[PDB]
């Protein structure tokens, strides 16, 4: 089916998380769940994504998939042109929907393979390590935001380290961080959540 | 074909990088390139991997793939039992090799889908952030090792940050780090490669 | 097949590890993988091993296996003499190879049962607890050697204890141990690998 | 024939020298020596190179070469579609190998023309002017490396100038450069090779 | 067609830039655009160029092109003598114009291949690094001249470096350079264009 | 008709003004006035412009225009392939000129729609806010240049503001600006044109 | 037969020794040992050598050898055109191999005569008299290198003279030469080999 808003949302996450974050490809493959055409899949993506990424993925589609077609006719499928074009001649919606289910397996695998291929820019997440917690904002909630998105981008929650500790420290508001740095070194989450829980 | 050593190597990388590092799944899908049986694929993996991971992936194989079979017979493939068991009745090597190429697409997609599913433990890389550069070891080569594997695990080379700077610092030998910390703060790779290039 | 060198190697390990170390019986059963004659198995072992061990195992073979034959003819196998002698009358290589596969199961089980029976001397590993690390030798590599072989003999890596700590200590070179004992008590592997990493 | 490693090597040189260094195009035209298909030539290059470069060169291939086809049919060749597509309809390996030798001349000229067209990024060589000679590394060998690669990139050995002299100076180790700068100004290669030839 | 003046101009650029500067071969291949005879091409070049270069290129023409003819008759072109002489027997203008278009591809490729081969002297550009800006001449325009021609010869605009900075410095008039050297070190183009913009 | 020089000129303005300045699209649509082929329009633009921009615009041409073709055949035009390819099969110049005038309306609208789509880099005008008036150059003429081009890029003459006042100030020569800043704050164009009108 | 590497090696020696050193012509005549075509001999040499040398030798070949042909037909050989062209009409490999053995004598003599004719530049050996022994390098081995190559170029080992003595002296490292010059004048090889045999 046509996913509209969640597509927009993953595009937003793609610009913040990058088309490499376990998040993004997880959602990719999640949407790939449905028997549907790569044609509109890719029109959709080039709508959210930017052109050359798209057309490159689809050109490598043509190349590798028609090599697969070589193999398929070595095995003798008798296919690979029309659907395995994205749209060959009359793939107008349903005429493309005429997929073989194993042909659907092929097309879905190829689309996700493509999407898997091309590299992201390489720097959409800097915000994570960046400025701080907002001063008025609650601290532990900010830290929770931090570790959750750090798992999102780093790929695991188990990135937490004195690196992450001083990341939160610098990111804490001047009040809370100014309490923590004189508080102790080797200070753990319990100390922070204990201390800075007020407004004043 | 039977990949032996590189399989061993990815298993080693899986215990160090984890079955989440872009490295590991990249190699997974790279090996998935060949028309072959998921049966020996999975026997291989359960040989390198540990059992429950394997049999769980293959049970979810059965479940989701026989739902796919529901759909396939809604479309009317007339298949999904024998090959889409891993081995149904007489999948003895070649009799399994009797795959439909679209059936191969399905099985490869399902295997990689499974492997994609289950979570790693969550902490095979601690060594990265860990002890140091060896004292006798050359420093810049160590740093190169660091950023390369940091890209391996973090998923991008663009993790480098004053975090990574003090990571190298602590990791540098007492000589080089003892030169760098008095040297300057805000010190970049050029400074390190400049300074500590000797033996004495 | 004829394993030559690895047999020699396990014999070496048997004199150092003893025919009790999980290592040795693991390799025993690993070699037992093949449909082959206990005859040459045992000629091989008595070649590496020493006679009375061998002939005793094979005498208990005769005894328990011919009791098994009692049972087999209670069930009525109609066998147990020729092959279940090791060589009865014309077991000359292939004529012995005429094994029943369930007969092979029996013979392999009996051979490994025998090998399992007789006791080792009781002291081939003293070297482990013994003299030291060589002075010029690297320390942490020595310690790694220590814990690996300690797992080999003790049967688990989880023998490591302040016992093992002072074992390494005494075993460390006079330099490193003379650094460690004044360094601290309750000192862990991190401390050792940290300190003694040099040559001078 | 299939050049594998040297292709990898020129790709490495392309990232260091750039697809403009006399080196790179010299090797390009050197490989172009053989009667072979631009199809796999270009698949190869897009394998080493990055996509848009490739497909752009091949699109301009289509454009200019089909203008050439205009001319060819003004002269009346009766060709330019199938081979002069890269693969028109059945250029499957040998069916493409069905080239006319003058048609091969055309295709080789067109491929090299394309490759000649598109511009490099513009900065893969900075290393040349960059950090230094390694301190332990021998100096004159480093200088030799310098002038050789300077010829590689600049296109001639006759770039050597007091620019290059102070380039080597800065690049020399602190020992050798600290000897040379007090040594003299207007110092030539003979002076450097004379002075810094030791270890200490 | 007969290019007269631009040929003269590239010859001038060849004596200043050398028959290696991306400029010169770019113009070479640009003129090669037309279906025409290598005969007058080469008469033209030996008119601008100097003899041995020419006749050497054309001798290697004969050699490599008649090896190509070997191959062509292995493929069976049935040609290579008359046109693939430059003029065999009756190549008098139009009778040479009787080229096959694939034969034209061959001849153009061969001519440009030749021209590509032979080496320049090795030092036509010294003027670039040389004397200075004229004193009365405007400085920034001179610098623009510098970087443009430096791109011409070096092959890229990205040669600009403190080398090029002191090149302009020395090249600046005594007034402007005498202002700049006391002005600052690490001075960029903005500083120069800012300062020396006057006459007095 | 073939516009040559003005095309070059708009390309120059595109690199200085950007393909967003009201100037550039005004000229675009001005040239679009003529019944002509998008084919050569786009060959022209990709000649001045850079490839991916072009081919992207034309790919979106294919996509949206063949959706328009969907609609056209819902209305039943019976067209959209050959001309609405840019060149389908025999669009060789006149055979493309066989456009329907409403088909020309479509193609012109599509071409300008494309050109309208893709984004400029985002920074070709910095010169505007940049260095200054040349010292010898007349001031008010420079200011006139400023406001005219500021209208060109900003899209209106009504950008003039104390921002623009200090822009001219900084841009004025040291003489004139050094007269104006002590002259007054809130100084208008009349003051500047009054004061700095001399040479000395 | 095709000598590849040794040809490369003599070319290297030709650039260092010059095509006059007894070495080079000795190797020339050594290779001339085989009944083979001067055609590929000369293609080979012009591959290692540089063109005008080659074609000049072969032009004088034509001249003197066709004078020899004058004489041959005064004696009435009835030959000298085809083979005594290098390749007359159908000297394609074997058809050239159709040499008369006395004709081979003629062609070999002519080729070596040519090669004997033309003069070397006149200065490829300066290195010999040049910089020094490397400081770390062993001295007597360096001296051995010296006299061996001095025999190579000078044509005899009996060049050794107080000239050669001070050549080695200057060439000795500062240590050894600084020992020798105060050691004695009229010092012979025995003194040097005696003294400087150490490292320190």
Numbering used by the authors:
A (entry chain B), B (entry chain A), C (entry chain A), D (entry chain A), E (entry chain B), F (entry chain C), ...: 19 to 218
Article sentences:
Immature retroviruses are built by the Gag polyprotein; Gag is then cut into domains, and the resulting CA capsid proteins form the mature capsid, which can mediate infection of a new cell. Murine leukemia virus (MLV), the prototypic member of the γ-retroviruses, is commonly used in comparative studies and as a basis for retroviral vector design. The CA domain and immediate downstream residues mediate protein interactions in the immature shell, and, following proteolytic cleavage, CA forms the mature viral capsid. In this study, we have determined the structure of the truncated MLV CA-CTD by X-ray crystallography and have resolved the architecture and CA lattice structures of immature and mature MLV particles by cryo-ET and subtomogram averaging.
Surprisingly, the quaternary structural arrangements of CA domains within the immature lattice again differ significantly among genera: although the arrangement of the CA-CTD appears mostly conserved among RSV, M-PMV, and HIV-1, the CA-NTD arrangements are quite different. The general architecture of the immature MLV lattice is similar to the previously determined HIV-1 and M-PMV Gag shells: it consists of a hexameric arrangement of Gag in which curvature is accommodated by the presence of multiple small defects and one larger defect rather than by Gag pentamers.
